[PDB]
Amino acid sequence: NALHLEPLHFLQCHSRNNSPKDLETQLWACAFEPAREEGHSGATSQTVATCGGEAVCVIDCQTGLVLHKYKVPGEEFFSVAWTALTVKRWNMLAAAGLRGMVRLLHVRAGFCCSVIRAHKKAIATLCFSPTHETHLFTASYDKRIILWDIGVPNHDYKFQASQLLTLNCSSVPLRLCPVATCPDSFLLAGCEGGCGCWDVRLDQPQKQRVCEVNFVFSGDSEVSGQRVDGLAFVNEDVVASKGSGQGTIYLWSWSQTWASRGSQSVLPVVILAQLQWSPTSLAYFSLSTCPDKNLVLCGDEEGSVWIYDVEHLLKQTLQPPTQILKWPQPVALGQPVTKTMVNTVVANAAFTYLTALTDSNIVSIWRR
């Protein structure tokens, strides 16, 4: 336990039919709330939004209490994302999934402000611009990524959303990731068919845009054209990305890759290092990062969290994790939950709280 992490809570709060027996609902996404005041980093945020089944929960990591819950019959929520708006700061929570609708929650006030019918198919994931807090990307099974401006809320807390760009994908988009050094100019997306970069500059005049560069990670025909289901920046230049069935997380340089590009629409990335991850062929284990601590985080099919401190690596063969945080088999209904999978793992920016979501209707909360 080199990172000195301890399990704090295992919350069963997305249960179907309000049942204590639900140890099966898949939890799909989680996101720490920003600071509640402008100018604060929010790095020690201890409030996390989670979604799964018909529900979005907002949880205090410290106490484990569910502060807020939003439930929509017949929805299946796949993605949550926060944005800090200036109205005084309002922390808005966007939630979406099966129904193709973005539901904008004013959490503190206790209600859903507005709903955007963004797609006619499910939304796989949502992502706000870090710099233009009203700009929202929605990625859908209709093989589009749409960039929205949700606008300012009117006096009665209503939003009038407009469409800024449509990004056309050759396969379903799974994971969104703005380019760290130019997040309103280029967007990365991990898709069922690999990882791409789209030009999202609004000063270019085309409104429907195909991928500018499709990336290549391996010359192995066994992996060519395979999904990229985890994608995040470890620091301003270095991207961590992965697919399934490869036992590997790739660390690559945005700047060196982009510099090599020219006009090529298909481009091998400049790889900096490769990390050993689980060998599972199972799909949709996403990764995340904690840049301030130089960490990559990725759950696996046994419910472990692989943790990599890549500082020394990136300053100077598959590299091993720094720590593998095993599933601690907490007791439910008096019996150990001996098996689960952790498909999403997210830490606050200071790495004082870590949340690991399972396929067992359990939100795992660890403290450092």
Binding site: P7, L11, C13, P20, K71, L105
Partner: peptide, 18 residues
């Protein structure tokens, strides 16, 4: 090791409404 804590709808502190 904490056990799994069930949080039912009546245990939530606040429900968000439409």
């Amino acid at each position: 090791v904490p056990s799994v804590q069930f949080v039912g709808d009546d245990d939530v502190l606040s429900h968000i409404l439409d």
